[PDB]
Amino acid sequence: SMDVFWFLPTHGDGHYLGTTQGARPVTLNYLKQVAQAADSLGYHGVLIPTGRSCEDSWVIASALVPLTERLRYLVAIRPGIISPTVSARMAATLDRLSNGRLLINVVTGGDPDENRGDGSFLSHSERYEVTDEFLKIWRRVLQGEAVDFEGKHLKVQNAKALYPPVQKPYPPLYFGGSSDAAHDLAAEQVDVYLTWGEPPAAVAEKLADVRERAARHGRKVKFGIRLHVIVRETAEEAWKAADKLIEHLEIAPNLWAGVGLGTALVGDPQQVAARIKEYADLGIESFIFSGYPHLEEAYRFAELVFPLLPEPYASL
Amino acid sequence: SMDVFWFLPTHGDGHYLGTTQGARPVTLNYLKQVAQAADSLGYHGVLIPTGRSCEDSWVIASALVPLTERLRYLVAIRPGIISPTVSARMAATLDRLSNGRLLINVVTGGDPDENRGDGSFLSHSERYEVTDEFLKIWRRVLQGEAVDFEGKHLKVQNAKALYPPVQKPYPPLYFGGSSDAAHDLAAEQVDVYLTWGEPPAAVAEKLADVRERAARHGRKVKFGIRLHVIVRETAEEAWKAADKLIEHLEIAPNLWAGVGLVGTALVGDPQQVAARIKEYADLGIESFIFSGYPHLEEAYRFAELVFPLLPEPYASL
Amino acid sequence: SMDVFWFLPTHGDGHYLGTTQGARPVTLNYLKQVAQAADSLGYHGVLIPTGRSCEDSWVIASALVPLTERLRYLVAIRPGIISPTVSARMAATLDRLSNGRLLINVVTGGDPDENRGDGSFLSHSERYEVTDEFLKIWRRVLQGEAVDFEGKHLKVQNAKALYPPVQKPYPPLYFGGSSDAAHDLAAEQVDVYLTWGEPPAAVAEKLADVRERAARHGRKVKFGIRLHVIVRETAEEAWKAADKLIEHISDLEIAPNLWAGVGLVRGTALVGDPQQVAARIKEYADLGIESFIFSGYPHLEEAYRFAELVFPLLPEPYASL
Amino acid sequence: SMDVFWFLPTHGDGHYLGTTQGARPVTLNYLKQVAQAADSLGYHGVLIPTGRSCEDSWVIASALVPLTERLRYLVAIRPGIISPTVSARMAATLDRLSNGRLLINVVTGGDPDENRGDGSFLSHSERYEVTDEFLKIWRRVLQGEAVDFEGKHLKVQNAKALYPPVQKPYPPLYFGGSSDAAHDLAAEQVDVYLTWGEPPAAVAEKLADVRERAARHGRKVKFGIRLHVIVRETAEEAWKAADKLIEHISDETILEIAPNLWAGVGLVRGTALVGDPQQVAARIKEYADLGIESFIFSGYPHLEEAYRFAELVFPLLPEPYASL
């Protein structure tokens, strides 16, 4: 098993970082270009970032659903800024219109200035307490249950979502975060645990922790990894583009941390495929890639790396 | 002027009320049919309801925006269940993707059980206090201000919506409600005051009240009305269709209150229906939000029968 | 087995015949409405008429293909006004973009004024000779053959269509016409034989003729019927609607529930309650008719009316929709 | 006064010529990608090729029209393989559905084997006689006339197209061809005369010739040029990209004829502009100084190069492209 995702640049696109030269603004037309590109090329889905620097994820995901056939949308929900019941009704509606193509990314929100701008004044420990109570109401409501919940942060009485989702029991929950409270939350409620691109040894340390905590609850979770990718026909062109990307550091074999100014895979197709094989051998089944620009690099990655990956990507 | 809206049946559609016979389930395909029908027929916009009994308004409005050209979308926001900054960012994004075709309907939420199901436990006065503080942040945030606000219910620090809306200063605010707090809220913040279908005397009393309260805030508000409509070629067919609607009450000339058994409706021939519309416009009402069962067929019926009797541009479409 | 089609009014739509009152002009928006209506309601396909009084069938069908999911399109080809090779490439392209949703309606062209307006000057016998040679080149080219053909009317040397169709051996061929030469052409080359709405005994006679000729060619052809439909909740409302359709025509039930009023302006129609309409459909189906191409005025509302009133009385999958 | 077109690769796309490696087959999805790219990037229109090696132009242009807003479509008609009345009705329908975005490319058909494959057996002189009679019927039919015409090759009686086009008197006629009979036909009937990418002096001779013949008919025609384009940030990368494009071309199936005018693409099917953005814009400025107002560009791959040309060359071109 392997699910290869791409990325929707709802915060802006371009060729280079740290400059407005060659910048591509977020428009409906260009978002359609990237989304329909990932759709026809055979990517499993697309990840939509969230935050103050982005256009709204739910508006954009809903706008692209009727313009695409098979592509799934990994949409972020932010507990603490919306009612869990309302969030569940939004998820059910979009999952129904998409015929079961919705995936949920649970985002706790790190930036305190951004959280206060949204009206949330919570400590780090309180944010995960809200997410824990949020997901409990959200998951139970989407399964047809009339929820009565009174927790430390959230309180609902007779919460109902009258329109059932297509995916059962609910759209899959993706979650990232390296905190101790985050790993407990992932092991208890989520379906796929996400991590940034770290060296294989450090990733295995994170995975084994979540795997053990989930076993204490009698659960098993799948694993995914997030990686930028600069892949070229030869290794020389790839590193030249990585330098060119940050004009205006190799922490592991072909693992470049320049985008963190998380990390990126830089090299020829065999090198890039070998690092993917190393991550897959650890138990990772989801891969979320990105590249600059997001339109051209979606074709670049599909034409250079897909033939070296397992089916169905080998046949695309 | 005059803006004639239609209605998206996101709570279900059909031929008859109080029965599942002849029901049409809400699907993406059928919502496209109604929306694209209103788009090509020349309706100014379409109203999307909200509530526990509906699919989410924002998902549906966003899905239909890139499938329509001119049609506007009157989407409901519910203060008290979402952060004002986030709601403004949702509004800005949909207004930008739609190229300035977004209209916002401020809905406070009447059902106390439904409000408790969403996590809101507020008295009647408290719901309007939240809406007042919600709108103050929402309006200023969409105007490019980094807002610091600390009220009784809401508090934001450095609230920003980085992507400006297309419509300036922000998408127009439509608002309904007959409470004392509702008329005060409308007179101070909203752009269009909405009312259900009542006899002209009852509407004129409401319109005169808001108009006087808005003058105390140095503003003028436009007025709109929400009305179901059962119009046929002759008056006999219209009343027979009205009777068949509730098989499984005329409180005013051609004003039928049968739909309130599950507001009111205009029933009659085109001249009778057009005459009641002229009466409402003579009171100062410029927006009309109509509906009919089924919403696809009746949208064509109203357009072909009543549009020629309305002012331009509807007379020429 | 049963295929229920609808109709795209590419010549104009409306509520009444013989008047411009309540007319709906052919626009892209209104064509999308009808096509997407038939798509979502579950009709097998939609028939697109041809002629000088219509917009071009190929432009409209190609425009609606990416806007619909399952709906098939019965598009007309006119032998004698286009090269067979070029027509084959058009069919191949539209069938590929549509993922195998193209159906071909072979129209020989009856009106002599319209045929001369297009530059075709052929007698009745010559008209079918051209169609016969056209279909042979068309069918062979779409099967990957480099065709050398030199006939009485058409001549090609090394005719090739490089892009194969999705449907094999080629998009299904529909054909109508009751003449002796038409039945010989249908029994030999086409896939579905079509007929207008006649009384069941009159339909059965044509079907028996084509069925007898096709057995001599070692083939079987399916049969379809073209029928207008005015179905209402009660029989009284249905006949009142039929009267209103032809009210504005200046100076009728030729069979049980078979009304020939639509044959005034430009075949027949089924008028009655849902059980009466479903029974006449069962009679036609008992004769061997497997395709039904229905129409109604207006084409948007009546597509819903027929689906909500008649589909539950038809075989699956229409009974469950 | 400049209209910049792109190209729809309805015959196939890819990264390199002479190889199937990295090839992109013609699909509805990929055609949507290129067409919607040119639409949103601000290209005036897109050219759709014709021939036995292509998918049908009319099906593809009609399929993409309802998926685009401003992009125009330059679609080929081939006289001799379709009735003029039918061809005119097709044009009228597509021009109505597109709200006046249809452009017509008059293609006479050069390949004799391909013409015989379609049933056309005509000499070079006869081919232009058919086109001349075809366009006369086509133009008049689209203007509401019931046309009675009896020529050497075509004959119509009461030819009518009942649905008028949006663009008056008819969708603009584009025409290419360097033959002596071709220049006579262009000077008499068409709106825009097209030429392949030749040195500016050779182009000036063709344009001045057509200009003079059109004055003998009391008309003026606009001029356009067809050019491939390989533009990179620096001149070195552009020539390196040009060399890599024809690396895999077999010598069995077998170059800078002018400053930045490279004839390597003509080894399969004309010429290309190769260089940095300033070099490419300067050669465009030269052709425009001759009187050329339409420019039809293409690049491999056609999706990526549509963005590349718009991001590198549009700012150096006149308005409105300079602000896009």
Residue numbers in the entry:
A (entry chain A): 0 to 247, 282 to 294, 300 to 354
B (entry chain B): 0 to 247, 282 to 295, 300 to 354
C (entry chain C): 0 to 250, 282 to 296, 300 to 354
D (entry chain D): 0 to 253, 282 to 296, 300 to 354
Question: Can you quote the paper on this entry?
Answer:
In MsuD, IS-2 and IS-3 are involved in forming the MsuD homodimer, and two homodimers arrange to form a dimer-of-dimers architecture.
The 2.8-Å resolution crystal structure of unliganded MsuD provides a snapshot of the enzyme prior to FMNH−, MS−, and O2 binding. The two tetramers align with an overall RMSD of 0.34 Å for 1188 cα atoms, indicating their structures are largely identical. Of interest, residues in all chains within IS-4 (between α7a and β7a) and from L354 to the C terminus lack any electron density, preventing their modeling and resulting in a very open structure. Without ligands, the active site lid, the sulfonate-binding loop, and the protein C terminus are disordered. Apart from R225, many of the residues that interact with MS− are observed in alternative conformations or are completely disordered in unliganded MsuD, which supports binding of flavin prior to MS−. Both R296 and S299 are located within the V295-G300 loop connecting η7d and β7c after the lid region, and these residues are completely disordered in unliganded MsuD or are observed in alternate conformations with FMN absent or at partial occupancy.
